[PDB]
């Protein structure tokens, strides 16, 4: 009834919800669940309170946010005189390395009902998998799937990577006085985001460090660890000390490595993209673009893997609502998803320029969010909804706005 | 007694498990589980020939036999305008099956006979602390630049870049041969291809080893990325496959040819071949043993890595129980016995990338001689499995011309 091209967190959450609801559904991934382990590091985003709270609804919390999950940000911003300020989470967001948690979606799926084709679908088999089912989704931008979903020029500003990147699971990091995320920016150099995740061999640590081009910090994507894994971890722990010494201080030299294998460690770059949330066949029939496809964003944030959750919930809804699955059921469908997803691309893209040209109402903001907790929880808090961060950060008036309520 | 591995592979696992069949002491270093294996992009598509699968039924690792998911002869095809198209037989079956499949089997075995694994990335500076905790420390990956230790012999390492531009995959919807056999293609001066019917996730699969020339009409298929656009890359494939190689092509379904199982089963690049010494000391004093890759680096056109690999760990397994010193002394006993077919897959191997692409007038009279000769190409099929006698074919123009004079 309802073919779904790709598994990760979009196509799962959406075959795990159609099949609460008695919904045919089949799923076409190239991976095997016992195959995750062996993989380079995925999406290293993490799942807040509200992904949290839909994977308990779907009977999928393996591993609940209380007892593995984070709590709060901690904020390191360098410089000649550094900040040092804390927000909480209402709620605790958690993250688990991928390649635990997506085969015990899938392990979960299979077991309710849900059909498996472990294959690799390219844009040329859409067409014959569109006749075959009610409504093909898809969530998934390998095998080149993302050039079917046209790109939108007005919601899409860069074309490049804006950012250098060097994401891994560490061990060796001691946690903060609470369990929680520390988002440390060393001005025109980089960010990084800290953050507590289950893996293989227990809780480690996962550093996101987005590097600046041409900065003093952007070496540490294109250093491999495998070339000599020495070099790497020293190179690691002086950058660290002198950028983000927050996260540096607590971390012990002797231990410090990577938390299970060099597979640990995922270099790059990503180009943020927001794309057409459907597209129209050469044989007249429409297929919806879900997660990934429909927008690329960059991991600062990481608002990726909950944007999935989100959308994924929601086109669930509309399956069940509609019986026509054409222009006016994608025009319901994005009237209630695009908002909070167009949000989350606008408001990444947004802080990705304003922390390398550092303007004068942003710098304007952090003095007052570091001065102010209650600004500092909100701030925090707010990660799990983009669109009224977007109404913070839209324009200097609302800026300023935000600003005057506080202080 | 007490024997320290730097690194798994065919050459860790095979040595291991030798020596645990005597009692002793094993431990090996590796920065990857067995059950990681399935899920990491593609690696060495090399296959074993009949003295690798004797060593390892000899050491009770033999999971796929020979005659289920072995071949048992080379097809030969040399491209022009009169193409050449003959064969010869193994006199034992060669064997190739998915790395990601057969290290773990390794792995396991070696795991339940008491060997010993410390999952961890070794530097080079760990080195001297690790040759004090054990008798011998025995090193064997390329990996965490440990080959530096290792002093390059540059009288034997002729190259310092990649002779060929490398594209290697596994692939579906490629009929066999009338034999379950390997293919070796020449397109004269645009590369080599090496297709290998190999056991892999879904069962049995054909690799592509594509030896690209540089500058050539093929280079280009090292360069353009899979995950870009599948179909663009295919096609490219099917169009390059059907030009250069195709007795290969002929056999390809283009409506299902396509990776095997995913995106991972692809791998572009280039080998830098080099022959270092087998032997390196620490500012301690102490003696350590290099093996494998890192003492010989070979490029997969003739597929002699593997077979190499276990070849040396057989052989340094044995030194190890006939001496109690491991020195200057002990290095001289082991590289006396496993030198000359190490350095001969070296030697035969570089002859081989620089007479391809020269095409020298002796080796021309060769290629003659061998493809209307199916005794010379059973002979020189067949010694895959001896590189030192390919050495004693190859060695000197005389020798050539001795070989087809007698097979003439």
Known sequence: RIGIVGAGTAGLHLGLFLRQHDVDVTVYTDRKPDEYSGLRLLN??????????????????????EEFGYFGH???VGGPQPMRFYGDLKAPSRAVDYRLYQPMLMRALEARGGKFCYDAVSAEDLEGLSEQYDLLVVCT?????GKVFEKQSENSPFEKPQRALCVGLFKGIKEAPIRAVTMSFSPGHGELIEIPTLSFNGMSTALVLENH????????????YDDDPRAFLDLMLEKLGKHHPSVAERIDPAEFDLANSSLDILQGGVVP?????????????????????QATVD?????????????????GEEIL?????????????????????????????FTLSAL?????????????????????????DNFNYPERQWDRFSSPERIGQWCSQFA
């Open 299 to 315: 991991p600062v944030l990481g608002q990726g893997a909950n944007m999935a959750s989100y959308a994924a919930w929601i086109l």
């Open 321 to 349: 609502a509609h019986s026509v699955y054409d222009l006016r059921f994608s025009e319901h469908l994005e009237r209630r998803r695009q908002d909070r997803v167009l949000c989350a691309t606008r408001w990444t893209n």
């Open 74 to 76: 901690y904020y390191y």
């Open 273 to 293: 993209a927001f794309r057409d949330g459907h597209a129209t066949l050469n044989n007249g029939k429409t297929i919806i673009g879900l997660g990934d496809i």
């Open 141 to 145: 931008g390998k095998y080149a799937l």
């Open 213 to 224: 081009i041409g900065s003093d910090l952007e070496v540490l994507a294109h250093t491999k």
């Open 44 to 65: 290293t985003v993490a799942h807040n309170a509200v992904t949290v709270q839909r994977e308990v609804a779907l009977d999928v919390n393996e591993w609940p946010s």
């Open 356 to 380: 390398s040209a550092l303007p004068p109402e942003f710098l304007a903001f952090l003095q007052i969010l570091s001065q102010s907790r209650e600004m500092a929880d909100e701030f925090t």
